Amino acid sequence: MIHFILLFSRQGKLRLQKWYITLPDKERKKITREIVQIILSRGHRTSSFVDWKELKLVYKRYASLYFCCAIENQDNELLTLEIVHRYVELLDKYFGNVCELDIIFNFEKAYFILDEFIIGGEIQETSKKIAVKAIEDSDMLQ
Amino acid sequence: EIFELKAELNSDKKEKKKEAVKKVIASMTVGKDVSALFPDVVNCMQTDNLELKKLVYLYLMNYAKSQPDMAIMAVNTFVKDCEDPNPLIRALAVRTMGCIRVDKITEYLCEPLRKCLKDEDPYVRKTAAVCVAKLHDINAQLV
Amino acid sequence: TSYDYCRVPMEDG
Amino acid sequence: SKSSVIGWPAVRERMRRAEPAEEVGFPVTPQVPLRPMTYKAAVDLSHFLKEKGGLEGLIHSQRRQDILDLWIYHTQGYFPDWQNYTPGPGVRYPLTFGWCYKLVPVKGENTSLLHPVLEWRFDSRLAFHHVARELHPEYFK
Amino acid sequence: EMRILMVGLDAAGKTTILYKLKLGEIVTTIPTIGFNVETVEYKNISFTVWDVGGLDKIRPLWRHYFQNTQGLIFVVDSNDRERVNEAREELMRMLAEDELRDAVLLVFANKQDLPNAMNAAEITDKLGLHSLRHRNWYIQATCATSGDGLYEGLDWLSNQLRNQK
Amino acid sequence: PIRLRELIRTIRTARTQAEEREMIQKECAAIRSSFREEDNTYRCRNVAKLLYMHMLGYPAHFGQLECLKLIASQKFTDKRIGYLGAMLLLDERQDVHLLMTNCIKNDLNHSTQFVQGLALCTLGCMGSSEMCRDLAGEVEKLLKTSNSYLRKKAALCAVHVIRKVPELMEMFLPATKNLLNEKNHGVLHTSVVLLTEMCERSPDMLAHFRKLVPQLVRILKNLIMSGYSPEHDVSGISDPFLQVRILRLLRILGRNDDDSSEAMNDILAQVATNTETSKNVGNAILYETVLTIMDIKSESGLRVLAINILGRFLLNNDKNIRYVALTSLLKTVQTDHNAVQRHRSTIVDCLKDLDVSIKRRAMELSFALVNGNNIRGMMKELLYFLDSCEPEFKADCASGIFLAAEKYAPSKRWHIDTIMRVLTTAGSYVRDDAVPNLIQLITNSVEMHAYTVQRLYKAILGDYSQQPLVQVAAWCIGEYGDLLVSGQCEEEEPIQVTEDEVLDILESVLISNMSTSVTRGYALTAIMKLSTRFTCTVNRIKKVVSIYGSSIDVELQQRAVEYNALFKKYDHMRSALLERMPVME
Amino acid sequence: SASAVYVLDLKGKVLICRNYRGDVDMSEVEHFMPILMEKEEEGMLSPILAHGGVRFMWIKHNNLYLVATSKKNACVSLVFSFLYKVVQVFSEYFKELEEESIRDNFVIIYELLDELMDFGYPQTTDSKILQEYITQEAPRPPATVTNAVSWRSEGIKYRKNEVFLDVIEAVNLLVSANGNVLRSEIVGSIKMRVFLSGMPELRLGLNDKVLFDNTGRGKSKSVELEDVKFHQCVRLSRFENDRTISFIPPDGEFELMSYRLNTHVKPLIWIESVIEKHSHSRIEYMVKAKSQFKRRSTANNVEIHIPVPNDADSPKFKTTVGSVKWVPENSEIVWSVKSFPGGKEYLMRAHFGLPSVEAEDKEGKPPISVKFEIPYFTTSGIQVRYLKIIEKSGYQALPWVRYITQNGDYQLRTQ
Ligand SMILES: Nc1nc2c(ncn2[C@@H]2O[C@H](COP(=O)(O)OP(=O)(O)OP(=O)(O)O)[C@@H](O)[C@H]2O)c(=O)[nH]1
Ligand SMILES: [Mg+2]
């Protein structure tokens, strides 16, 4: 179960939170501040995973933007990184040359892309074609 | 890149070596490891421009610890400039003398310090008084 | 300074 | 070249933020006399570019030229056809009689996630020995 | 616009003849720990002069000028026979370089007022100047206290710099 | 009203965060004022600009009602904005989110599947336990549909309501019956994750669900044998997301069964050999494959192969795989216990790795690797590794030293020796919670307290500032003081026990600021016991109790006065209750 | 006692670095900002930090962190007074002091760091005399640099001889929520603008109470200065004797003196405000502003800053005279009145709404600060009597003054 997802910049500037676990905003602002501090204080050969407080916290840098998940401590990890990468692919799919500044701008659909991909903390479409198809149709619905 | 900079640093024209040493302490301003070019800016130190000599004094003080052995290429130039009739250039050397911390150097500089202890202008004498404590900071018993 | 000045005496003996 | 100092880092930033690789019409500044970039002013400018710095060895391009030339016209009053150079074959020599700079060939987050050109050279005899005239004799009579 | 050096073992009067050429005076100078540099305008060629003293701690530090280096002057110390041998091993250390290749050799017979000083032929034969391939050398007798022999060596050096009328 | 990206561009020009807050409250007021206008036009964008500020971390409690208006809108984009911030601004404890319940229920009956997709999205992400109680029949109704766009969504939404309401899954036992033949993989994936959830909660559901184990053994074998599809394929590996979930469902099934464990045995022997271990994907396939084999009563030829799979994974230079391999043996500690023990030096190697998590998994698995055979040698590595821990691992190691030592200590003396070693070298890192445990085991120890209390005394003269160290000592001095100072009622030949510096070292704690006052709580307790445990020099210690009756700690002001009346009125009743404490477990 | 004085930015990268002893490592600066991130986010912020034995004395400019580092028991006020002086001298050189001022002008700024301080010992910090041999456009140092008179160079010559004084009042006020005045002191400050020829010794006299008590005129109008802090140039030993304000001024604008006194008379303008904060509903501010000061006097361009709630919305303002701007960016209202004479009393009735949902957290109570300015009006009643121009050449200067009364800290604690 993905407990939440964080996308924060090279400066730590969070471009996405998605709490699949219900914890209050002070706790949201506390925990988010810590893990950004944790990941930015972490090197490049540090196994792309953090065992953070009963959350095998998954991080995987792809660009200046950083990435974060909190998986349940009974689940898979490399696939959890592949979940990020499949979502990276879907961001690479729906955008193409997927890039930093419309993460800042067109984030609203990046949530919607996540809504077409992960609801509840888990995957609903294991295809990469059918999901971006559906969001285009709802975009074709406008 | 730095060699083209060292080409302009080993130039004979003033306007090329003046802009070269500005780029060095601008590279030092942006915090570049410009310590490798140490004894080469030392060649364009003994200059008639007093405005330029402060930049090298800025460099030599900053990279004295980095190049302690290469810092022996300034002792003659300090005792040269403790004697020029501008009191501005004498006290400028004196405060550059005491802040440069290489123990290979501080034994040689006590006499132009002693010279500037009994200088005339209040400007260098209030500068030379602190350089004693700078020397006593470096080598207390030599004082 | 849009406000104007006022002249004081010099000595006040 | 006094008011060309206040935009000397400002417009060059817009040049450097321009990639080297609404609006309609053309306004003219009222009552300001206009003249082309003359010889001695190009000597005044080539030394203004020699002294103020930040130009030599920079990646020249056409977008940077047009940012620069219109800014000269709107702030100094000079016809923005003076920064013309010889075309592709050969060294990009200036057609301008007095421009002592020839053109020899040589942000960061706008990049995507996973990825699925000239420069100046000072030549003070371009003001007298028009080398672009040697590259284009039949056009200059 | 051509540069020139003043190297060699110390206590040889080279900073004396430096400011004899620069000013024209016999100057009071410490044993030169760092270096000296001024320039001399003579025969319309700027004899820019680089002195480096001969202390032991500044013996390895001669290389830091050897980038962009066109001339050479070795100042012998012939009043010291016990130190002309280590100055000779100093000379073959300096002349065994592939970086100093355009530099013509220019020996100054200095301190020419003592009768123990040799001529311009014995010092040549003791040091082995003839065995120096790709080395255009010429020994020059320079008395420091008077100033004679200085500008004639600067004449031959000016014939080593330019090769014109 | 300006657009979103126009606002963001202004926000991207902000330098100081305080200056940025000025730009926030600039626009935020216009968002508020527009909300006072009850606008429906820019209510799309004003909420969108607000959610940005919410993502920027600003108090956007006020616009939440407008989100309910955007859910209760009629335009699709206003819904498309409205369902989003409902997942953002509202949670279960938001307490105003209950008004969605009618709105979602109408929009579970909306004509557009995408509107219903938005409704299943928002309820699936953050549907409240009572909202889950109020939408349960509608989700299974949208799970009884044929729209695979909705069947993929109502399945995971049904997981959510079973996650939120655990007593609700019994109406989904009929819902899940025989939809396991879905041609789509995504709906079939969500059904597996649902059947992962359904098998997770109730053991009573396992009987109905272990029946269809060979059904999916076929379908998983179909995934291996359909080696390519244009979708689902990453690096030549077809639908690995579904494949792991089947294995995880095959992990929780057959874990105490054998017939289903043999019904799944073949494809386990297949994909342990029929995987491409080149890319990250096939390792992720093979990792769960290892974990599936360990947790079921599997074929023994699988598990021997599986350690040989892991012996490869121990030696891959990918720290991912090293994190994977260390987690793997951290899982199957007890299961196939000795095939782990032959990989012991690999674990001691990863103590010297330069990653926190790798050193974390190695230290904890070393805490798991300790049997009664490696107890002597490995602790010497670990007590050395305790010296070579990070301060974050120093608290973690020193406790985990104490855990395995209480298990498999071959001696009671050597059990004391290592703990006394750790208490000297952990200090501020060893937790105070293990101190009653250490106190219990040394009074579970019955035989070496003359051995213990002297070594306790020999290190506390070194320091006191190690607070959990001197937590341990003061109870031992109070209880086993007779074994420290022995037969020394008067002055004798000087032995190291001297019954006055014994009393001074506790008095040194009482005045020292580096005392946790339960140090001083234990100390007066030790003072009052040594009125009885010592016959040597009492009533000089009464002075120390009597001067402490004006102390500033509340209980330690209680503790001294409650002692002192026994020291002043009931001197014979002092020893009448200072019998040693009983020993429990 | 400094060892290495650094300048950081809002990000913590070194704008400019300069050591004076070498006793603090140059890479110690990179721990400061995370410790600054540490101490602030735990609320343990102090102007001195410590990474082991390196002590981090710093001030904070608009962008800048003038971090002066040391290790020993350095003299602390020696550091920070120099820190505001370096800000001041840079403000004397660079009309704004930001990242553009540093990175474009490192030619002069490193020379300033060489000049202002040696070893940690500030020796020359008067910027006006420093302009004469440290230029951004070198000769010998001036004699005024050597001289005990270190603020005024000789040979300064003008066509006219103008002495421009600015007796400036600054009314502090602390009114509680009870409506009583807690603390209303007045910090007045006479700042001089001298345009004079040569080396004059100016001797000033006021309506000092003590000087009138020494004269025997302690029954007439005499201001009572509780403490003054003067310029260096005032010979304080001459002032200690007999209240004698005797000095050689520098040339140009400078604050000579800084007097401070308490005053048990009313505030010049009394404010009555109310708050009808209706829960989840709205808020109302029926605020009036009566002027207690003199009717001939007029409070120019007053700016009444009343802190409103953050989620306050739908503003309504029933003023009498003067406009309101609502500043949600400061979460407040500025009921601005340009001309507000003494004796006048203008009401303003504010009305917002409030969200029917509550907010998450508290806000606290900022007081109300207004921005009055009354010219030609000494509330303390200070009067310059004369100004003795004493020149060896001898001239008749033009001494001039104007009186301006403004707020100091004009806080009035709200409901
Ligand atoms: N009698 C006599 N003494 C000389 C003559 N030339 C140089 N000397 C002596 O040699 C000493 C060395 O001269 P300097 O020029 O001061 O020192 P240097 O040879 O340059 O040695 P460094 O300073 O280390 O480079 C001087 O102190 C003179 O006394 C000379 O022509 N006649
Ligand atoms: Mg010499």
Spell out the residues 6+ positions from residue F411 whose beta carbon is closer than 8 angstroms to its own: none
C-alpha dihedral (D65, D68, D71, D76), degrees to nearest 10: -110
Distance CA G108, CA G130 (A): 12
CB distance G142 to G129 below 8 Å: yes
| Ligand 2 geometric centre to CA of G406 (Å) | 69
DSSP label at residue E65: G
Specify the DSSP class assigned to residue E61.
G
CB distance G189 to G258 below 8 Å: yes
Which ligand has its closest atom nearest to the C-alpha of E13?
1
E112 is in an annotated binding site: yes
DSSP F234: E
Written as one string, the DSSP assignment of B23-86 is HHHHHHHTT---GGGHHHHTTT-S-S-HHHHHHHHHHHHHSTTTSTTGGGGGHHHHHHHTSSS-
The yes-or-no reply on D/C contact (3 CB pairs or more, < 8 Å) is no
What three-state secondary structure class fits E8? strand
Q: Which residues contact B3 (CB under 8 A, 6 or more apart)?
A: none
Q: In the structure encoding, which two tokens stand for residue F197, read together?
A: 């959830």
Measuring CA to CA, how many Å separate D30 from each of D33, D34, D36, E25, F563?
A: 9, 10, 17, 69, 101
**Atom 16 of ligand 1: nearest residue by CA position:** E29
CA dihedral G51, G79, G116, G12 (to 10 degrees): 40
Beta strand E3-8 with E45-52: parallel, antiparallel or unpaired? parallel
Spatial CB neighbours of D62, under 8 Å, sequence gap ≥ 6? none
CB contact under 8 A, F36 and G360: no
Q: What is the resolution of this structure in A?
A: 6.8
Other C-beta atoms closer than 10 Å to the C-beta of F310 total: 26
**Helix-helix angle F467-479:F519-529, to 10 degrees:** 10
Residue pointed to by tokens 């004469």: G132
Counting every residue written for chain A, the total comes to 142
Q: Which residues of A7-44 are buried (b: 16+ CB within 10 A; e: fewer)?
A: bbbeeeebbbbbbbeeeebeeeeebbeebbeebeebee
CA atoms within 13 A on the CB side of G124: 28
Token pair recorded at residue E66: 């050897």
Q: What is the CA radius of gyration of chain D?
A: 17
The span from the CA of F64 to the CA of F56, in Å, is 16
Q: Which tokens sit at B71?
A: 């810092």
Contacts of A75 (CB under 8 A, 6+ apart): A1, A56, F248
In angstroms, rounded to a whole number, what is the distance separating the alpha carbons of residues F151 and F189? Answer: 11
Report how far residue A77's alpha carbon sits from residue F361's, in angstroms, rounded to the nearest whole number: 14
Q: What are phi and psi of F530, to 5 degrees?
A: -75, 0
From residue G59, alpha-carbon distances to G45, G80, G82, G109, G126 in Å are 12, 7, 11, 18, 20
Residues 6+ away with beta carbon under 8 Å from F306: F272, F289, F290, F293, F294, F336
Which strand (E) or helix (H) includes residue G323? Answer: strand G323-327
Q: Give the relative orientation of helices F43-55 and F76-89 as an angle to the nearest 10 degrees.
A: 30
**G387, C5: Cβ pair inside 8 Å?**
no
Residue E55 CA, closest ligand 1 atom number: 24
CA distance F182 to F150: 13
For chain G, give the residues followed by a break (C–N over 2.5 Å): 137
F550-576: b or e for each residue (b if 16 or more CB lie within 10 Å)?
Answer: ebeeeebeebbeebbebbeeeeeebee
Closest CA to E2 of E110, E103, E140: E103
Dihedral (CA of F27, F31, F36, F38) sign:
positive
- Pair F188, F238: CB distance under 8 Å: no
CA torsion through residues F53, F57, F63, F68, sign: positive
Q: What is the DSSP string of A67-97?
A: EEEEE-TTS-SHHHHHHHHHHHHHHHHHTSS
Exposure b/e, G95-114, CB count within 10 A at least 16 = b: eebebebbeeebebbbbbbb
Distance in angstroms (rounded) separating the CA atoms of residues E94 and G306: 83
Q: Do residues G134 and G115 touch, judged by C-beta distance below 8 A?
A: yes
Give Cα separations from G90 to F502, G86, G96 (angstroms): 65, 6, 8
What is the spatial distance between Cα G26 and Cα G19, in angstroms, rounded to a whole number?
A: 8
**In chain G, residues 360-389 whose CB comes closer than 8 Å to chain C:** 375-376, 384-389
Residues of A (95-134) whose Cβ lies below 8 Å from F: 104-108, 111-112, 115, 119-120, 122-131, 134
Contact between F438 and F472 under an 8 Å Cβ cutoff? The reply is: yes
Token digits of residue E105: 């050799």
CB-based contact G141 B58, cutoff 8 Å: no
Q: How far is CA E142 from CA E5, E29, E76, E148, G54, in A?
A: 16, 18, 11, 6, 59
A vs F, Cβ pairs < 8 A, gives 160
Angle at B10 between CA B4 and CA B12, to 5 degrees: 120
Residue nearest to atom 4 of ligand 1 (CA): E111
Chain gaps in chain A, named by the residue before each (C–N > 2.5 Å): none
Tokens 């477990």 belong to which residue? F585
- Kindly give the number of the ligand 1 atom that is closest to the alpha carbon of B76: 23
Q: Kindly list the distances between the CA atom of residue G69 and the CA atoms of B36, G20, G53, G113, in Å, as whole numbers in the listed order.
A: 27, 10, 10, 14
Bridge partners of F124? none
Tell me which residue of G245, G206, G184 sits closest to G381, measured CA to CA. Answer: G206
- Exposure on the CB side of residue F414, measured as CA atoms within 13 A: 10
Amino acid at G250: P
Measured CA to CA, the distance from residue E14 to residue E7 in angstroms comes to: 8
- Beta carbons of B137 and G119 less than 8 Å apart: yes
Say if CB F412 and CB F449 are below 8 A apart.
no
From the CB coordinates, do chains D and A have 3 or more pairs under 8 Å? yes
Q: Which of F102, F103, F64, F112 is nearest to F85 (CA)?
A: F64
> CB burial class (10 A; 0-12, 13-18, 19+) of residue A73?
exposed
Whether chain B lies against chain G with 3 or more Cβ pairs closer than 8 A is: yes
* F283: nearest CA partner in chain A: A78
Gap between the Cα atoms of G129 and G145, Å rounded:
7
List alpha helices for G171-225, DSSP H. Answer: 209-215
- Rounded Cα distance, B76 and E55, in Å: 12
Find the Cα–Cα–Cα–Cα dihedral D60, D61, D62, D65, rounded to 10°.
-30
b/e F360-375 (16+ beta carbons within 10 angstroms → b): bbbbbbbbbbbeeebb
CB atoms within 10 A of CB F415: 19
User: What are the residues whose beta carbons fall under 8 Å from the beta carbon of G408, sequence distance 6 or more?
Assistant: G170, G171, G172, G173, G185, G186, G187
| F162 contacts F168 by C-beta, under 8 angstroms | yes
Q: Comparing C-alpha atoms, which of F414, G409, G309, E34 is closest to residue B78?
A: E34
CA–CA dist D100, D118 (Å, integer)? 15
List the A14-19 sheet strands across, edge first.
A14-19, A2-8, A66-71, A55-59, A49-52
Please work out, in degrees rounded to the nearest 5, the angle formed at the alpha carbon of residue A92 by the alpha carbons of A88 and A94.
115
Which residue has 């001022």 as its token pair?
G101
Cα separation values, F134 from E6, F98, F129, Å: 99, 10, 9
Contact status of C3 with chain G (Cβ, < 8 Å): yes
The candidate with the shortest Cα–Cα distance to G6, out of G79, G78, G93, G107, is G79
What is the dihedral angle through the alpha carbons of G170, G175, G179, G181, rounded to the nearest 10 degrees? -70
**Integer Cα distance of E88 and E125 in angstroms:** 12
Q: Look at the block and give the residue holding tokens 């040391």.
A: G70
Which spans in F142-279 are helix H? 148-164, 185-201, 206-209, 213-225, 240-252, 259-263, 265-271
Residue/partner pairs of B60-63 with CB below 8 Å, 24 or more apart: B60/B96, B60/B100, B61/B96, B61/B99, B61/B100, B62/B28, B62/G19, B63/B34, B63/B35, B63/B38
What are the angstrom distances between the C-alpha of B89 and each of D102, E141, F144, G107, G146? 43, 38, 93, 17, 15
Assign residue D136 a region (left: φ > 0; alpha: ψ between -120 and 50; beta: otherwise).
Answer: beta
In the structure encoding, which two tokens stand for residue G383, read together? 């009067």
Amino acid F439 reads: I
Q: Which chain F residues touch G328 with a CB distance below 8 Å?
A: 25-26, 28-29, 32
Picking from G43, G126, G37, the residue whose alpha carbon sits closest to that of residue G85 is G126
Q: Determine the Cα–Cα distance for residues D139 and D84; give it in Å rounded to an integer.
A: 14
E16 lines ligand 1 (CB under 6 A): yes
Nearest to D70 by CA among D85, D61, D58, D83: D83
For residues F177 and F195, the answer to whether their CB atoms sit within 8 Å is no
- Interface list for chain G against chain B, based on CB atoms closer than 8 Å: 14, 16, 19-23, 103, 106-107, 110-111, 114, 118-119, 121, 123, 133, 138-141, 145-146
H/E stretch holding A133 reads helix A129-141
The enclosing H or E element of E157 equals helix E150-161
| DSSP structure string for E90-146 | HHHHHTS-SS--S----EEE--TTSTT---TTHHHHHHTSTT-TT----EEE--TTT
How many helices (H) and strands (E) are present in chain C, helices listed first? 0, 1
Give the distance, in angstroms, between the CA of residue F551 and the centroid of all CA atoms in the same chain: 41
Hey, which residues does E134 pair with through a beta bridge?
none
**Smallest CA–CA separation between F32 and chain G, in Å?**
6
Q: Rounded distance, CA B37 to CA B6, Å?
A: 8
E149 CB under 6 A from ligand 1? no
Neighbours of chain C (3+ CB pairs under 8 A): G
Q: What angle do CA E14, E19, E20 make, to 5 degrees?
A: 90
Phi and psi, residue F187, nearest 5°? -60, -40
Q: How far apart are CA B75 and CA B97, in angstroms?
A: 9
Strand partners, D120: D103
Q: Name chain B contacts of G118, Cβ cutoff 8 Å.
A: 95, 99, 127, 130
CA distance F429 to F397: 9
Are G286 and G274 contacting, i.e. CB atoms less than 8 angstroms apart? yes
Cα distances from F511 to residues F506, F507, F514, in angstroms, run 9, 7, 9
Alpha carbons E106 and B93: distance in angstroms, whole number: 35
Cβ–Cβ gap B12/E48 under 8 Å: yes
| Chain C residues in contact with G386 (beta carbon < 8 A) | 8-12
| Site from G163, G168, G217, G301 to mutate, C interface, most C CB atoms within 10 angstroms | G163
DSSP state of G223: B
Q: Which residues contact G384 (CB under 8 A, 6 or more apart)?
A: C8, G165, G167, G190, G204, G205, G206, G401
Which of B46, B74, B108 minimises the CB distance to E37?
A: B46
Around Cβ F290, how many Cβ atoms within 10 Å? Answer: 25
Q: Which two tokens stand for residue G327?
A: 């500043």
E13 lines ligand 1 (CB under 6 A): yes
Nearest CA in chain E to B70: E61
Contact indicator for G368, G284 with CB cutoff of 8 Å: no
Chains that touch F (3 or more CB pairs under 8 A): A, G
Q: How far is Cα of residue F428 from the mean position of the Cα atoms in its chain?
A: 23
What separation in angstroms does the CA of G366 have from each of E75, E97, E158, G191, G407?
82, 79, 84, 31, 17
F94 contacts in A (CB within 8 Å)? Answer: none
- The dihedrals phi and psi of G259, each to the nearest 5 degrees, come to -90, 160
- How many other C-beta atoms are found inside a 10 Å radius of the C-beta of residue G342? 18
Angle at G104 between CA G98 and CA G106, to 5 degrees: 95
Signed CA dihedral, G61, G65, G66, G69: sign only: positive
For G106-112, which contacts have Cβ atoms below 8 Å and span 24 or more sequence positions?
G106/B25, G106/B26, G106/B29, G106/G16, G107/B22, G107/G136, G108/G134, G108/G135, G108/G136, G109/G16, G110/B25, G110/B54, G110/B55, G110/B58, G110/G16, G110/G18, G111/B54, G112/G86
Return d(Cα G208, Cα G220) in angstroms, integer. Answer: 11
Q: What is the dihedral of CA F378, F379, F385, F391, to 10 degrees?
A: 140
